[PDB]
Scaffold this active site. Structure first.
Site, PDB file in Angstrom:
ATOM      1  N   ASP A 192       0.800  -1.223   0.000  1.00  0.00           N
ATOM      2  CA  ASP A 192       0.000   0.000   0.000  1.00  0.00           C
ATOM      3  C   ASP A 192       0.830   1.268   0.000  1.00  0.00           C
ATOM      4  O   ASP A 192       0.262   2.359   0.074  1.00  0.00           O
ATOM      5  CB  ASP A 192      -0.958  -0.003   1.219  1.00  0.00           C
ATOM      6  CG  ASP A 192      -0.231   0.080   2.536  1.00  0.00           C
ATOM      7  OD1 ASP A 192       1.006   0.189   2.624  1.00  0.00           O
ATOM      8  OD2 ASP A 192      -0.919   0.038   3.595  1.00  0.00           O
TER       9      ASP A 192
ATOM     10  N   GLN B 140       2.724   2.563   2.204  1.00  0.00           N
ATOM     11  CA  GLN B 140       2.802   3.150   3.544  1.00  0.00           C
ATOM     12  C   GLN B 140       3.802   2.300   4.319  1.00  0.00           C
ATOM     13  O   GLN B 140       3.622   1.072   4.319  1.00  0.00           O
ATOM     14  CB  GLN B 140       1.439   3.153   4.219  1.00  0.00           C
ATOM     15  CG  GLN B 140       0.429   4.110   3.559  1.00  0.00           C
ATOM     16  CD  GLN B 140      -0.827   4.202   4.420  1.00  0.00           C
ATOM     17  OE1 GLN B 140      -0.881   4.285   5.653  1.00  0.00           O
ATOM     18  NE2 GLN B 140      -1.961   4.181   3.719  1.00  0.00           N
TER      19      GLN B 140
ATOM     20  N   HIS C 220      28.813   6.862   5.274  1.00  0.00           N
ATOM     21  CA  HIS C 220      30.117   6.166   5.459  1.00  0.00           C
ATOM     22  C   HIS C 220      30.176   5.014   4.490  1.00  0.00           C
ATOM     23  O   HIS C 220      31.195   4.764   3.800  1.00  0.00           O
ATOM     24  CB  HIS C 220      30.171   5.711   6.931  1.00  0.00           C
ATOM     25  CG  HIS C 220      31.386   4.880   7.278  1.00  0.00           C
ATOM     26  ND1 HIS C 220      32.403   5.426   8.082  1.00  0.00           N
ATOM     27  CD2 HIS C 220      31.760   3.611   6.958  1.00  0.00           C
ATOM     28  CE1 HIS C 220      33.333   4.475   8.210  1.00  0.00           C
ATOM     29  NE2 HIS C 220      32.988   3.345   7.538  1.00  0.00           N
ATOM     30  N   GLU C 221      29.104   4.210   4.478  1.00  0.00           N
ATOM     31  CA  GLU C 221      29.073   3.009   3.625  1.00  0.00           C
ATOM     32  C   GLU C 221      29.148   3.368   2.142  1.00  0.00           C
ATOM     33  O   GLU C 221      29.895   2.776   1.340  1.00  0.00           O
ATOM     34  CB  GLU C 221      27.826   2.133   3.906  1.00  0.00           C
ATOM     35  CG  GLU C 221      27.734   1.621   5.341  1.00  0.00           C
ATOM     36  CD  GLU C 221      29.033   1.000   5.862  1.00  0.00           C
ATOM     37  OE1 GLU C 221      29.811   0.470   5.080  1.00  0.00           O
ATOM     38  OE2 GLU C 221      29.194   1.048   7.107  1.00  0.00           O
TER      39      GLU C 221
ATOM     40  N   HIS D 282      32.538   4.231   1.007  1.00  0.00           N
ATOM     41  CA  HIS D 282      33.456   3.125   0.658  1.00  0.00           C
ATOM     42  C   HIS D 282      33.357   2.802  -0.813  1.00  0.00           C
ATOM     43  O   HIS D 282      34.392   2.544  -1.432  1.00  0.00           O
ATOM     44  CB  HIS D 282      33.132   1.917   1.485  1.00  0.00           C
ATOM     45  CG  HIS D 282      33.712   1.931   2.875  1.00  0.00           C
ATOM     46  ND1 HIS D 282      35.055   2.132   3.141  1.00  0.00           N
ATOM     47  CD2 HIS D 282      33.129   1.713   4.076  1.00  0.00           C
ATOM     48  CE1 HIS D 282      35.282   2.060   4.448  1.00  0.00           C
ATOM     49  NE2 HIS D 282      34.105   1.792   5.058  1.00  0.00           N
TER      50      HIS D 282
ATOM     51  N   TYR E  21      42.425  -1.971   2.006  1.00  0.00           N
ATOM     52  CA  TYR E  21      41.796  -1.935   3.326  1.00  0.00           C
ATOM     53  C   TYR E  21      42.685  -2.571   4.383  1.00  0.00           C
ATOM     54  O   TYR E  21      42.258  -3.512   5.080  1.00  0.00           O
ATOM     55  CB  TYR E  21      40.432  -2.647   3.255  1.00  0.00           C
ATOM     56  CG  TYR E  21      39.442  -2.251   4.337  1.00  0.00           C
ATOM     57  CD1 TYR E  21      38.994  -0.945   4.423  1.00  0.00           C
ATOM     58  CD2 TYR E  21      38.894  -3.134   5.259  1.00  0.00           C
ATOM     59  CE1 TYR E  21      38.094  -0.535   5.380  1.00  0.00           C
ATOM     60  CE2 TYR E  21      37.979  -2.781   6.227  1.00  0.00           C
ATOM     61  CZ  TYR E  21      37.592  -1.439   6.275  1.00  0.00           C
ATOM     62  OH  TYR E  21      36.661  -1.030   7.202  1.00  0.00           O
TER      63      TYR E  21
ATOM     64  N   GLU F 209      39.095   4.398   5.820  1.00  0.00           N
ATOM     65  CA  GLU F 209      38.133   4.578   6.904  1.00  0.00           C
ATOM     66  C   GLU F 209      37.877   6.053   7.205  1.00  0.00           C
ATOM     67  O   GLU F 209      36.719   6.485   7.343  1.00  0.00           O
ATOM     68  CB  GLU F 209      38.653   3.864   8.172  1.00  0.00           C
ATOM     69  CG  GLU F 209      38.159   2.411   8.251  1.00  0.00           C
ATOM     70  CD  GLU F 209      36.645   2.374   8.160  1.00  0.00           C
ATOM     71  OE1 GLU F 209      35.984   3.070   8.977  1.00  0.00           O
ATOM     72  OE2 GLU F 209      36.055   1.671   7.332  1.00  0.00           O
TER      73      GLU F 209
ATOM     74  N   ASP G  52      26.986  16.560  13.910  1.00  0.00           N
ATOM     75  CA  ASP G  52      28.077  16.558  14.851  1.00  0.00           C
ATOM     76  C   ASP G  52      29.307  15.940  14.206  1.00  0.00           C
ATOM     77  O   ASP G  52      29.181  15.504  13.068  1.00  0.00           O
ATOM     78  CB  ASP G  52      27.727  15.793  16.144  1.00  0.00           C
ATOM     79  CG  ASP G  52      27.088  14.453  15.805  1.00  0.00           C
ATOM     80  OD1 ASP G  52      27.822  13.694  15.155  1.00  0.00           O
ATOM     81  OD2 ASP G  52      25.931  14.239  16.195  1.00  0.00           O
TER      82      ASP G  52
ATOM     83  N   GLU H 206      30.739  13.293  15.579  1.00  0.00           N
ATOM     84  CA  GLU H 206      30.764  11.924  16.100  1.00  0.00           C
ATOM     85  C   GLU H 206      30.239  10.960  15.078  1.00  0.00           C
ATOM     86  O   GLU H 206      29.512  11.371  14.168  1.00  0.00           O
ATOM     87  CB  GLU H 206      29.882  11.804  17.356  1.00  0.00           C
ATOM     88  CG  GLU H 206      30.188  12.942  18.370  1.00  0.00           C
ATOM     89  CD  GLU H 206      31.503  12.639  19.057  1.00  0.00           C
ATOM     90  OE1 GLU H 206      31.519  11.634  19.810  1.00  0.00           O
ATOM     91  OE2 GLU H 206      32.453  13.406  18.828  1.00  0.00           O
TER      92      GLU H 206
ATOM     93  N   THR I  43      24.183   2.066  21.107  1.00  0.00           N
ATOM     94  CA  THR I  43      23.767   1.932  22.503  1.00  0.00           C
ATOM     95  C   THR I  43      22.559   2.798  22.862  1.00  0.00           C
ATOM     96  O   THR I  43      22.678   3.867  23.497  1.00  0.00           O
ATOM     97  CB  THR I  43      24.909   2.285  23.478  1.00  0.00           C
ATOM     98  OG1 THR I  43      25.373   3.608  23.177  1.00  0.00           O
ATOM     99  CG2 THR I  43      26.067   1.316  23.313  1.00  0.00           C
TER     100      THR I  43
ATOM    101  N   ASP J 109      41.890  -5.768  13.458  1.00  0.00           N
ATOM    102  CA  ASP J 109      41.156  -4.747  12.696  1.00  0.00           C
ATOM    103  C   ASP J 109      41.889  -4.373  11.411  1.00  0.00           C
ATOM    104  O   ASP J 109      41.986  -3.191  11.039  1.00  0.00           O
ATOM    105  CB  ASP J 109      40.910  -3.526  13.582  1.00  0.00           C
ATOM    106  CG  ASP J 109      40.053  -2.466  12.946  1.00  0.00           C
ATOM    107  OD1 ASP J 109      39.133  -2.764  12.177  1.00  0.00           O
ATOM    108  OD2 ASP J 109      40.289  -1.280  13.255  1.00  0.00           O
TER     109      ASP J 109
ATOM    110  N   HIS K  95      40.041   1.021  11.740  1.00  0.00           N
ATOM    111  CA  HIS K  95      39.051   1.818  12.444  1.00  0.00           C
ATOM    112  C   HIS K  95      39.609   2.486  13.710  1.00  0.00           C
ATOM    113  O   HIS K  95      38.896   3.145  14.460  1.00  0.00           O
ATOM    114  CB  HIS K  95      37.886   0.925  12.933  1.00  0.00           C
ATOM    115  CG  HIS K  95      37.106   0.326  11.829  1.00  0.00           C
ATOM    116  ND1 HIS K  95      37.380  -0.925  11.317  1.00  0.00           N
ATOM    117  CD2 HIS K  95      36.057   0.805  11.106  1.00  0.00           C
ATOM    118  CE1 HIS K  95      36.511  -1.169  10.306  1.00  0.00           C
ATOM    119  NE2 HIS K  95      35.704  -0.114  10.191  1.00  0.00           N
TER     120      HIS K  95
END
Ligand SMILES: CC(C)C[C@H](NC(=O)[C@H](C)NP(=O)(O)CNC(=O)OCc1ccccc1)C(=O)O
Ligand SMILES: [Ca+2]
Ligand SMILES: [Ca+2]
Ligand SMILES: [Ca+2]
Ligand SMILES: [Ca+2]
Ligand SMILES: [Zn+2]
Length: 316
Positions: free
Chosen positions: A59, A61, A142-143, A146, A157, A166, A185, A187, A194, A226, A231
């Site tokens: 629909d 929505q 961000h993605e 890449h 990488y 990164e 921001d 950040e 979280t 990593d 990162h």
């Protein structure tokens, strides 16, 4: 799919209502025909086979809980497209309007997002560490960045080239967040990380050390976790980028800020004209100094500030 372009309405992960570009052919699909060769959002259905199925709705929505990560993946890919086209005159990630594909509901409890070589992929998070990661415009940009890097500089990488890779994604993810101008921001991932803890983030560009990451070359990580700290050591370049835009005095070295738009122009030029797959941090400094020289002149403030910033983080 072939169909007619329509406009759906729904709510994203954080509960905000927005309009999304869809396509009608029996169902309404998350296929935005208004941007290049299309933006396409898929349902991975909690599995890991990709891309999964093109998102279909009866629909037009999109207010179910299950819909929200798709709404935001789709909508924020559109915002990121607009940023690159309007600000850098770049048409999609390949510069030739390649179709942008994203899958949501990837896996179960999946606390990450990635570019798999061909498309964007978003977990839902485990509901403690993360809520669905497409709720973060900086994460979506961000993605998609890449993909831009892979089609341009091609930064490998791992180790320092991977830390630049990164940081480029965190830099443009942040510039897209400012472009959209909703709670912007320096950040990364604050909107989806979280949900029971306020005020934290995955990373900080302004103070990388707050979340464990180096803000000076002398503190670089040189082990193997990593991918050689991609990162982690990204904080050294993120700090340099922050200083270039915003200014500050860091380890006693003062940087005159030149603002977000010139930061974006300098790093977009570096990324597309000077960086190579194996560039290290010193080569990034050279690339940024030359980009700024091209744009503003070898005696400009902008060149002085890029040098100041890389001095401040110990990169010569
Ligand atoms: C807690 C976690 C989200 C933190 C971090 N991830 C990020 O910061 C962002 C959101 N994801 P990303 O795109 O950098 C993850 N990238 C990644 O997994 O690359 C591996 C890869 C995947 C697919 C093809 C080639 C390489 C990380 O992966 O360590
Ligand atoms: Ca519906
Ligand atoms: Ca924000
Ligand atoms: Ca952010
Ligand atoms: Ca939080
Ligand atoms: Zn990344």
């Amino acid at each position: 799919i072939t169909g007619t372009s329509t406009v759906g309405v729904g709510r994203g992960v954080l509960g905000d209502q927005k309009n999304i570009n869809t396509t009608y052919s029996t169902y309404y699909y998350l296929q935005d025909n208004t941007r290049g060769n299309g933006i396409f959002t898929y349902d991975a259905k909690y599995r890991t086979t990709l891309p999964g199925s093109l998102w279909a709705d009866a629909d037009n929505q999109f207010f179910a809980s299950y819909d929200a990560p798709a709404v935001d993946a789709h909508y924020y890919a559109g915002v990121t497209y607009d940023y690159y086209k309007n600000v850098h005159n770049r048409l999609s990630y390949d510069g030739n309007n390649a179709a942008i594909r994203s899958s949501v509901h990837y896996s179960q409890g999946y606390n990450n997002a990635f570019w798999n070589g061909s498309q964007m992929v978003y977990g839902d998070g485990d509901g403690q560490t993360f809520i669905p990661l497409s709720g973060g415009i900086d994460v979506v940009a961000h993605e998609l960045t890449h993909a831009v890097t892979d089609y341009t500089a091609g930064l490998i990488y791992q180790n320092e080239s991977g830390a630049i890779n990164e940081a480029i994604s965190d830099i443009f993810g942040t510039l897209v967040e400012f472009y959209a101008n909703k709670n912007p921001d320096w950040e990364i991932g604050e909107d989806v990380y979280t949900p029971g803890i306020s005020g934290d983030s995955l990373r900080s560009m302004s103070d990388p050390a707050k979340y464990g990451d180096p803000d000076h070359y002398s503190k670089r990580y040189t082990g193997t976790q990593d991918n050689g700290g991609v990162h982690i050591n990204s904080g050294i370049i993120n700090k340099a980028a922050y200083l270039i835009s915003q200014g500050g005095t860091h380890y006693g070295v003062s940087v005159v800020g030149i603002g977000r738009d010139k930061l974006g122009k300098i790093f977009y030029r570096a990324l597309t004209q000077y960086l190579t797959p194996t560039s290290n941090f010193s080569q990034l400094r050279a690339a940024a100094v030359q980009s700024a020289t091209d744009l503003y002149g070898s005696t400009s403030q902008e060149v002085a500030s890029v040098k100041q910033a890389f001095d401040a983080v110990g990169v010569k």
